[PDB]
Amino acid sequence: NQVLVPNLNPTPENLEVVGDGFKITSSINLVGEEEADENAVNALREFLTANNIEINSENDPNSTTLIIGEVDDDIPELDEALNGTTAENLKEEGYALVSNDGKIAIEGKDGDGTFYGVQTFKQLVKESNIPEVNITDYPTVSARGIVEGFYGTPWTHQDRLDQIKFYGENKLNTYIYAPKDDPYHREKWREPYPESEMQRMQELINASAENKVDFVFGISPGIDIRFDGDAGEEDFNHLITKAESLYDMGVRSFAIYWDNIQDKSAAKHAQVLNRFNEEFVKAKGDVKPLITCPTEYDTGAMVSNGQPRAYTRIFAETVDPSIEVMWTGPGVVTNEIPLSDAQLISGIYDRNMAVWWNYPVTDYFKGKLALGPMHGLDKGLNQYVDFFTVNPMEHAELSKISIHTAADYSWNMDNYDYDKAWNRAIDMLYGDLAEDMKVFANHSTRMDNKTWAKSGREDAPELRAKMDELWNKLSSKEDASALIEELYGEFARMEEACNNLKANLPEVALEECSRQLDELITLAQGDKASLDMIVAQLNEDTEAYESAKEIAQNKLNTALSSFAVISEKVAQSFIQEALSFDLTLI
Amino acid sequence: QVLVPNLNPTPENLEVVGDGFKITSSINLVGEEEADENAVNALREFLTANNIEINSENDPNSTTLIIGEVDDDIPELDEALNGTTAENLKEEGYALVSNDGKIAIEGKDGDGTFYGVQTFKQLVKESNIPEVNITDYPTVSARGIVEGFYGTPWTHQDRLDQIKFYGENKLNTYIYAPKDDPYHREKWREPYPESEMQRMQELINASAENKVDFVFGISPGIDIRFDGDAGEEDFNHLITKAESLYDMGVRSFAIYWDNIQDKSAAKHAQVLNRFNEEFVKAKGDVKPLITCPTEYDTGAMVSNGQPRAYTRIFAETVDPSIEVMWTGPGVVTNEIPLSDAQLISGIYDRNMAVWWNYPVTDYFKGKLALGPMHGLDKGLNQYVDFFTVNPMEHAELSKISIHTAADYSWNMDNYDYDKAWNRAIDMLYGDLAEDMKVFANHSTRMDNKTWAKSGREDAPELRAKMDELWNKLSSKEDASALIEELYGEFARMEEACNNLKANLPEVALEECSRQLDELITLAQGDKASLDMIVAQLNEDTEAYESAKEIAQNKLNTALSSFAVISEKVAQSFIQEALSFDLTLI
Ligand SMILES: CC(=O)Nc1ncc(CN2CC3(CCN(c4cc(C)nc5ncnn45)C3)C2)s1
Ligand SMILES: CC(=O)Nc1ncc(CN2CC3(CCN(c4cc(C)nc5ncnn45)C3)C2)s1
Ligand SMILES: [Ca+2]
Ligand SMILES: [Cl-]
Ligand SMILES: [Cl-]
């Protein structure tokens, strides 16, 4: 009977169910349209239209009533429908939502809050039914988003527009434009963008404003920027001119990055930032705090023997307090940011830090897709961090899985459950293909280049535990029949799921993962043959063993030889384990 | 000035009370005719071997050595001890006092006096001895080896040498049970040939000489019959076989049920109980019967915290006096935590015996297990009164790990695996100790890639430095110093192994020469791996490709070979370096 609360992302801070729910009518009364946030109303109109829900011209008391507005708008209908629930005591971007007895109230703390209230409403409604809930909600972290800051083919204009919509839908409010292989960002940073590219930029800025996203325009001048004399003045004016060109199209957030460069002129880097902050940021008056990243940006690079290194010390002492400083954690690509690391670096800089999290980015190990949740990031990090971003894959569509979880982590940090969030991300993104995509993506969460880059949740941990249990059972001389049968089913399911994804995934997703799907099919076949080897030894069948051995070997060799990389420590490793296995040594 | 040298086992109580003194060219020996005969023989052997003559008449300028047991009333010994006593110590305990040209050795019993001599032997280095007060005794009552592996059994000469070695390190148990001796297992009814019976007599005599209990094992489980006239015949074959060894002096026996098809729990225990009644109790001077059930690891014995059917029936049936062996959580496993000992001890309602499967390598013969006792809980003596190790078929190189087992079993509470390991190589390899440490450090971790995993990780300090190299490179720090340090490390691996090839005695070298070559090959690959990194840092394509080919070839040779060493350190580093691309930083 009772209408259940569907999947929500981010998880709202406070949600109480206070009723059995109700069906929203074929047409609705909309109150507060003209006074409420324009972008919130546009998003609401889009949703209603897309779900065949008409807006009434005149009030119909038989129709459902939706009341929308901000706390500073005088809407008595909103106050009545809210019934004591308030948004005024909530932080910026916060909102209140109350659905009760054919009335939905949405009250933002501000215009951004009202917009995010609409996003929750959009997720609450399934087949015109809505639960009866009392919500007050607001972000843990002030700035939440993406930094397109990877090497490789930059995202297409269409990728970016789609990403911006997606960020709005999941309450992510920051998009930093800084692709390493854009010549006009970095290599040829002084040169103005072509008109065609400037028109694309304008479209991105408009889409960002439409979805409450701060478009942050990045510039990376550190390769060859000159600091002193007339050359210094010429180059600084190039930064201003470039920034001005994007300011004039609507950009109100800026980043100047010093990462991955030869030059470590600490004072000079900070002085360029301070001058830009004085002469541009403070000058314009409506520009958000300047963002940067120093040349030392991971703790290994920044700290030695618990003390800052020379560059970091000078940069920290020189750089203006208002400037947002990014760092990546203990390493460039690392397992965790524990609370002690954030404490250390925040202490050195004497400010709340910004995070450039290098997951799900795969530019260092392009064969594998990073399809796992936010993992290893301390749930108290908000104590020392006010700005959280992820560096995504060049593969924009499949980056959404990990980004979806980052929205949950950054908005509701204290209740973040990586496993539940990961499942929720695939459920909400893939729909009817969600269960099959889970089977595939479960094998492609761990990033490990075998040396310096290690991050993410382990691949297929439940399957790996069962594989370990097989070897233990065999050594203990127990009957492994039931476990072997279970594993045959697991490996069959991997093949079945991937074949269904090849047949039915939309091309936008399939074009990014087709080789990885084939890779996991090949490994699954090798895994099946690996079980055949074990069963053959148990039955003392040499012919059957040698036949299963050559298949297992061929499948492993193909997997190892191919560009695609997946399930290294689970599906791939199991074949190697099974090839080594000699039952006569038990 | 004179420091306390390496001791094994670590004595329970040791106090330094002086600057030490030089032992003279000749010595006065008091208590010869009253003291333990085996202790005196061991002492004479040591003195003779170190060119120390025994005075006929007392010389006051010569060092004096006074030896005896506590139950003897010997004033010369009491005076030199100066209040230190062995009377309140347990069995095998002793007191030793070195002070102002006098060394006093007092055993609680004959075994203690013997062990006192062993500590004395270790205390002396280049005729100098520290001035110390020692009281000392074992944690665990029965401490030793079970020759219970598959593969070529130890030679008669290997066994005689091992028995001496056990005496020297206060190990008191040697269980004869080699799987591939036909007369032990396959043809267990059949009598040993006279030539082999003479060799057994020699092992028994040597065991007595070194205070070792020779445990004669029989493994009848493959085809023993239990019921009717066939059951009587086969039981009498066990008695007959046991009797043959009893008549040469064997007073400890084992009947093992491991690694057999038959799981007739009640019948296994009934054979043991009948042997216990009709033989052990009958003879009256036979130590408790030792066994091992067919379910002997916790994975095989226990399901959902409760004993499995065989184990339940075996435990309820088997006589309380019988020592039951188990191997820990698995056959070859990382640890025996205290909870596992608790569980299994509780099931059997008795203190357990341990059959520890390290350093045995019969499941993965390519690698030598040269590491210390590792993962065994230091509280295990609560539930365990009998500790043994299954060694490698390689008897000489098994000494390294066995050395540490002597420390662990004698002084459990102060057991430090790292210190014990270093001490084992120092004490065994002498002038080659430093080089042998370099080699053996890479050959401690046993891992067959599936079910058998045990031992300390290989070369952990080097592995940490390799990790630090990758981190430094990613953090864009100057790695010059660390690269140079690693070049030194890899060069040292090659230098140490070549020296060991040239100078190790044949007895050791014949067991490890392939593994020495393996580590040399890996070290050469590791050097070439650094050359690859340096070539990328200098943007030298010619130098990179040259180093790459060498690294590739050395890796392949290492992988293809029978010999296995340093899989996660020296081997893995080459694979890591081949994967490394500096342009992706
Ligand atoms: C009670 C107990 O712990 N008893 C043991 N006894 C020998 C042990 C050390 N090895 C572990 C394995 C398991 C079996 N194995 C081999 C190797 C070869 C070369 N041939 C073999 N034939 C039949 N088994 N087996 C390797 C035995 S532990
Ligand atoms: C402050 C910060 O975190 N800034 C970053 N920016 C990009 C990031 C994610 N990737 C890790 C790597 C390390 C460098 N890298 C590549 C790849 C390729 C294909 N070409 C490259 N050329 C020079 N580097 N580099 C891989 C960058 S993290
Ligand atoms: Ca308004
Ligand atoms: Cl007991
Ligand atoms: Cl020799």
Q: Are B442 and B493 in contact (CB under 8 A)?
A: yes
Q: Are B89 and B108 in contact (CB under 8 A)?
A: yes
Of A556, A561, A502, A500, the C-alpha closest to A527 is A556
Collapse the DSSP code of B29 into the 3-class scheme (helix H, G, I; strand E, B; otherwise coil) and give the result: strand
Q: CB neighbours of A242 closer than 8 A, spacing ≥ 6? A: A189, A190, A192, A219
Residue to substitute in B363, B364, B394 for testing ligand 1 pocket (most ligand atoms within 8 angstroms of CB): B363
Alpha carbon distance A498, A443 (integer Å) = 11
B473:A452 CB<8 A = yes
Q: CB neighbours of B316 closer than 8 A, spacing ≥ 6? A: none
CA atoms within 13 A on the CB side of B1: 4
Q: Are B382 and B136 in contact (CB under 8 A)?
A: no
Q: Where are the alpha helices (DSSP H) in A29-105?
A: 38-50, 76-82
Q: What is the chain A residue with the closest CA to B472? A: A300
Tokens of B529: 């791996």
Measured over all CA atoms, what is the biggest interatomic distance in chain B, rounded to whole angstroms?
A: 84
Residues in chain A: 586
Of B302, B360, B309, the C-alpha closest to B326 is B302
Alpha carbon distance A146, A168 (integer Å) = 12
Q: Are B403 and B424 in contact (CB under 8 A)?
A: yes
Q: Does A585 touch chain B (CB under 8 A)?
A: yes
Q: Residue A476: which of B330, B472, B580 has the nearest Cβ?
A: B330
Which residue bears the tokens 């010390």?
A313
Q: CB neighbours of B348 closer than 8 A, spacing ≥ 6? A: B315, B318, B324
Which helix (H) or strand (E) element contains residue A239? helix A229-247
Residue B363 Cα to ligand 1 midpoint, Å, equals 7
Q: CB neighbours of A483 closer than 8 A, spacing ≥ 6? A: A466, A469, A470, A473
Which residue bears the tokens 């065999």?
A474
| CA distances to B238, B277, B284, B322 from B281, in Å | 15, 5, 5, 12
A476:B575 CB<8 A = no
Neighbours of A15 (CB within 10 A): 17
Which residue bears the tokens 């430093």?
B434
Q: What is the chain B residue with the closest CA to A469? A: B451
Q: What is the chain A residue with the closest CA to B362? A: A585
Alpha carbon distance B58, B343 (integer Å) = 59
Q: Are B130 and B22 in contact (CB under 8 A)?
A: no
B450:A364 CB<8 A = no
Of B536, B474, B579, B577, the C-alpha closest to A367 is B579
Using a CB-CB cut-off of 8 Å, the residues of chain B touching A577 are: 449-450
Of B375, B403, B384, B420, the C-alpha closest to B139 is B384
Q: What is the chain B residue with the closest CA to A365? A: B584
Pairing of strands A54-55, A454-455: unpaired
Tokens of A319: 């750089």
Does residue B359 have a cis peptide bond before it, meaning omega lies within 30 degrees of 0?
yes
Chain A and chain B share a number of CB contacts under 8 A equal to 72
Alpha carbon distance A524, A520 (integer Å) = 6
Q: Are B12 and B94 in contact (CB under 8 A)?
A: no
| CA distances to A377, B273, B314, B330 from B347, in Å | 44, 18, 10, 17
Which helix (H) or strand (E) element contains residue A16? strand A14-17
Pairing of strands A291-293, A253-257: parallel
Letter string b/e over residues B211-232, b meaning 16 or more CB atoms within 10 A of that residue's CB:
bbbbbbbbbbbeebebeeeeee
Residues in chain B: 585
CA atoms within 13 A on the CB side of A527: 29
3-state SS of chain B: helix, strand, coil percent to 5? 45, 15, 40
Does residue A10 have a cis peptide bond before it, meaning omega lies within 30 degrees of 0?
yes
Q: Does B468 touch chain A (CB under 8 A)?
A: no
* DSSP states along B278-321: IIIIHHSS-PPPEEE-SS-SHHHHEETTEE-HHHHHHHHHS-TT
Collapse the DSSP code of B30 into the 3-class scheme (helix H, G, I; strand E, B; otherwise coil) and give the result: strand
Which residue, by CA, sits nearest to atom 11 of ligand 1? B363
- The rounded Cα A12 to chain-centroid distance in angstroms is 17
Q: Does B579 touch chain A (CB under 8 A)?
A: yes
Alpha carbon distance A428, A433 (integer Å) = 10
Q: What ranges make up the beta strands (E) of A46-109?
A: 54-55, 64-70, 95-100, 103-108
Name the DSSP letter for residue B471. Answer: H
Amino acid residing at A280:
F
Collapse the DSSP code of B166 into the 3-class scheme (helix H, G, I; strand E, B; otherwise coil) and give the result: helix
Q: Where are the alpha helices (DSSP H) in B86-227?
A: 110-123, 156-168, 194-209
Alpha carbon distance A575, B465 (integer Å) = 31
Which residue bears the tokens 């050469």?
B524
Alpha carbon distance A55, A66 (integer Å) = 10
Alpha carbon distance B149, B158 (integer Å) = 15
Amino acid residing at B355:
W
Letter string b/e over residues A303-316, b meaning 16 or more CB atoms within 10 A of that residue's CB:
beeeebbebbebbb
Q: What was the elucidation method?
A: X-ray
Alpha carbon distance A130, A100 (integer Å) = 9
Amino acid residing at A226:
R
Q: Is A159 left (phi over 0), alpha (psi -120 to 50) or beta?
A: alpha
Q: Where are the alpha helices (DSSP H) in B411-479?
A: 417-429, 433-440, 460-474
Neighbours of A402 (CB within 10 A): 28
Pairing of strands B26-30, B53-54: parallel
Could you give the angle at the alpha carbon of B93 between the alpha carbons of B89 and B98, nearest 5°?
A: 100
Residue B106 bridge partners (DSSP):
B68, B95
Amino acid residing at B179:
K
Q: CB neighbours of A138 closer than 8 A, spacing ≥ 6? A: A13, A90, A91, A93, A94, A95, A109, A113
Residue to substitute in A337, A356, A364, A395 for testing ligand 2 pocket (most ligand atoms within 8 angstroms of CB): A364
Does residue B9 have a cis peptide bond before it, meaning omega lies within 30 degrees of 0?
yes
Alpha carbon distance B46, B125 (integer Å) = 12
Residue B174, φ and ψ in degrees, nearest 5: -130, 115
Pairing of strands A454-455, A214-219: unpaired
Q: What is the resolution of this structure in A?
A: 2.3
Domain definitions of chain B by residue range: 1-137, 139-454, 455-584
Q: CB neighbours of A250 closer than 8 A, spacing ≥ 6? A: A202, A205, A206, A209, A215
Tokens of B354: 């341990």
Which residue bears the tokens 């008595």?
A76
Residue B60, φ and ψ in degrees, nearest 5: -70, -25
Tokens of A188: 């040829």
Q: What is the chain A residue with the closest CA to B471? A: A452
| CA distances to A236, A271, A364, A583, B384 from A278, in Å | 13, 10, 37, 74, 75
Name the DSSP letter for residue A132. Answer: -
Does A364 contact ligand 2 (Cβ within 6 A)? yes
Could you give the angle at the alpha carbon of A291 between the alpha carbons of A288 and A293, nearest 5°?
A: 175
Pairing of strands B132-136, B13-16: antiparallel
Numbers of helices and strands, H then E, in chain A:
19, 21
Q: Are A70 and A41 in contact (CB under 8 A)?
A: no
Residues enclosing ligand 1, CB less than 6 A? A 585-586; B 148-151, 258-259, 292, 296, 327, 331, 355, 357, 360, 362-363, 390
Alpha carbon distance A45, A55 (integer Å) = 8
Residue A217 bridge partners (DSSP):
A177, A254
B470:A451 CB<8 A = yes
Alpha carbon distance A431, A501 (integer Å) = 12
Neighbours of A70 (CB within 10 A): 25
**Relative to the alpha carbon of A73, which ligand is closest?**
3
Residue B505, φ and ψ in degrees, nearest 5: -65, 145
Which residue bears the tokens 């509701």?
A412
Q: Are B193 and B229 in contact (CB under 8 A)?
A: no
State the virtual CA torsion across B32, B35, B37, B40 in degrees, nearest 10: -50
Across the beta sheet with B13-16, the strand order is: B13-16, B132-136, B94-99, B102-107, B63-69, B26-30, B53-54
Q: Are A164 and A204 in contact (CB under 8 A)?
A: yes
Collapse the DSSP code of B105 into the 3-class scheme (helix H, G, I; strand E, B; otherwise coil) and give the result: strand
Amino acid residing at B485:
E
Residue to substitute in A146, A155, A180, A334 for testing ligand 2 pocket (most ligand atoms within 8 angstroms of CB): A180
Measured over all CA atoms, what is the biggest interatomic distance in chain A, rounded to whole angstroms?
A: 84
Alpha carbon distance A211, A205 (integer Å) = 10
Name the DSSP letter for residue A337. Answer: B
Q: Does B582 touch chain A (CB under 8 A)?
A: no
Burial class (CB in 10 A: 0-12, 13-18, 19+), B484: exposed
* DSSP states along A353-420: EEEEE--S--TTSTTS-------SB-TTGGGTEEEEEE---S-HHHHHHHHHHHHHHHHS-TT--HHH
Residue to substitute in B154, B184, B259 for testing ligand 1 pocket (most ligand atoms within 8 angstroms of CB): B259
Q: Does B239 touch chain A (CB under 8 A)?
A: no
Of B408, B318, B400, B392, the C-alpha closest to B354 is B408
Q: Does B51 touch chain A (CB under 8 A)?
A: no
Alpha carbon distance A569, A171 (integer Å) = 35
A473:B299 CB<8 A = yes
Alpha carbon distance A405, A409 (integer Å) = 6
Q: Are B121 and B169 in contact (CB under 8 A)?
A: no
Using a CB-CB cut-off of 8 Å, the residues of chain A touching B585 are: 332, 452
Q: Are A261 and A293 in contact (CB under 8 A)?
A: no
Using a CB-CB cut-off of 8 Å, the residues of chain A touching B331 are: 475-476, 586
Of A10, A103, A30, A31, the C-alpha closest to A74 is A31
Q: Are A237 and A273 in contact (CB under 8 A)?
A: no
Tokens of A10: 């981010």
State the virtual CA torsion across B491, B496, B502, B505 in degrees, nearest 10: -170
Which residue, by CA, sits nearest to atom 4 of ligand 1? B258
Which sign does the torsion angle of CA A509, A510, A515, A517 carry? positive
Burial class (CB in 10 A: 0-12, 13-18, 19+), B399: buried
Q: CB neighbours of A53 closer than 8 A, spacing ≥ 6? A: A24, A25, A26, A27, A28, A128
Tokens of B456: 């300390």
Mutate to test the interface with A, among B304, B311, B451, B582 (most CBs of A within 10 A): B451
Query: Of all atoms in ligand 1, which is nearest to the CA of residue B258?
Result: 1
Alpha carbon distance A156, A294 (integer Å) = 28
Collapse the DSSP code of B181 into the 3-class scheme (helix H, G, I; strand E, B; otherwise coil) and give the result: coil
Tokens of B435: 């080089």
Residue B98 bridge partners (DSSP):
B103
Q: Are B334 and B454 in contact (CB under 8 A)?
A: yes
Tokens of A125: 């409604």
Tokens of A156: 């297409």
